[PDB]
Design a protein around this ligand. Sequence first.
Ligand SMILES: OC[C@H]1O[C@@H](O)[C@H](O)[C@@H](O)[C@H]1O
Length: 396
Amino acid sequence: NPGTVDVLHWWTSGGEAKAVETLKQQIQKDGFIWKDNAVAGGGGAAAMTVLKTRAISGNPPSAAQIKGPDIQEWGALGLLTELDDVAAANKWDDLLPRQVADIMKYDGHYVAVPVNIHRVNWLWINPQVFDKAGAKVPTTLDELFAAADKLKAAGFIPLAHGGQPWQDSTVFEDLVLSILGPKGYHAAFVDLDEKTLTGPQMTEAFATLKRLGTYMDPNRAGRDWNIAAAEVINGKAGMQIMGDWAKSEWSAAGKVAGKDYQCVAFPGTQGSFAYNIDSLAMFKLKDANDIKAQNDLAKVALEPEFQTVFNQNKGSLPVRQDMDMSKFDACTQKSAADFKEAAKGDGLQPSMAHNMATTLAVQGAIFDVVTNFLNDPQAEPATAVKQLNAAIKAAR
Ligand SMILES: OC[C@H]1O[C@@H](O)[C@H](O)[C@@H](O)[C@H]1O
């Protein structure tokens, strides 16, 4: 017709839209139609709502942004197409880290293609604001609170943080990873180990979340992750606890590491890398030309020029392993090194708040407990760990 590529995704902020624009361009350059279904919401709950309808509609999208264990559900439903021929030709097993390749498969077959590797456990710092505040870039939880104290004394928003469950739980899983360490983190969120979920360290994670919440804006509720990023970019806030999609906002605003921002591992998580892999699950299509388009999309995703330009704009690492890393920024090169380090040990771990560690149902119970707790200044950590365990059990 020539064929139309319809991807359902939630890349809509200033930076993320710059990244998706690279994909629109490549598809147009290849001679297919780009016809976007961008559904705005950060972390993707809104997009899923739209997907829950389109998926069974009779006009499924070509691909949707579906990650983690949730792919297994779409795979199990028989809604996704197997990508055996494209994966064989373009050598996907060779190009992708094994830990990532396994996630893309249903019963042995690729049914989704990854595009990136986000790290979730970053802290973003405005060095000009830290210098005005006489604050020090934190390496520990104690240093984090010291910087926060100083930022507050100096008149700044200490912690730029949007009030949405997925953001609350990004911060919380940072704290779990910080305090419990990667192995204990693994036990809580992957294995859902009751004893770990209700133990003293998890309890202390809630205690720390509560104090951290005493440095957040009282009126943060409903504030998108880009509004919080912007508070830092504009010099109103010292820091934001956010994954490296946050960098797409910095890069879109023309900013440079060192001078305008710094990226540091979330305090006490050095050596651990909380991954989030954006991936596009490919639905079985009926129309012949849209099938050709879908095959083109599947080709493009791991092409090295696309992997480069998409990820420079996106904030993430490329998922393809043979990449000239010198073409990316210093923070992205930090992330690669830290990825490598983490992946040798048990530091590499899936993000719970970004759909890699759990099913969406279990994630939902976690979100509700974390957010209900954070939003009640007088709530007891000992109570929070009981509810966490009970709600998780109640979800599966
Ligand atoms: O919406 C904010 C972020 O949400 C993540 O879950 C998604 O994987 C990222 O690509 C970014 O879009």
